């Protein structure tokens, strides 16, 4: 047998919370634009290794991250700094390139989403 790990933590009740213009942009513009993209659906929740029959996924990926987690974290004010959120997006993309062979469909989807992510981050407000 093999099991899914628990999904990443999405609330830190002991961490101070704030809403900033940049965090609002990350949620309402960056995450929203990627979420609605045609290639987003594999990235909208944690990789379900059981239902996808990938017993090696969490043997290889020890820092999983996904856009559903990022959305919940933003909604919970989990991030104090915009850079913490950006790091989670970066982790999500790099995990995909670690696990999957170059040229696989999922990798081309990640590369397209990453390009859009960088385009959105180019216009991060003050």
């Amino acid at each position: 047998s093999h099991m899914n790990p628990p999904p990443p933590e999405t609330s830190n009740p002991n961490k101070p919370k704030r809403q900033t213009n940049q965090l609002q942009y990350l949620l309402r513009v960056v995450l929203k634009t990627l979420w609605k993209h045609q290639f987003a659906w594999p990235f909208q929740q944690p990789v379900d290794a059981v239902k996808l029959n990938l017993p090696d996924y969490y043997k290889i990926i020890k820092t999983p991250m996904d856009m559903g987690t990022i959305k919940k974290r933003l909604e919970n004010n989990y991030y104090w700094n915009a850079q913490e959120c950006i790091q989670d997006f970066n982790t999500m993309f790099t995990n995909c390139y670690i696990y999957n062979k170059p040229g696989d469909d999922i990798v081309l989807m990640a590369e397209a989403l990453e390009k859009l992510f960088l385009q959105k981050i180019n216009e991060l407000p003050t």
Binding site: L54, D56, Y57, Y99, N100, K101, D105
Partner: peptide, 10 residues
Amino acid sequence: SGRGXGGXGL
């Protein structure tokens, strides 16, 4: 490094 996930409609 992994088994991979096959086709995704591309």
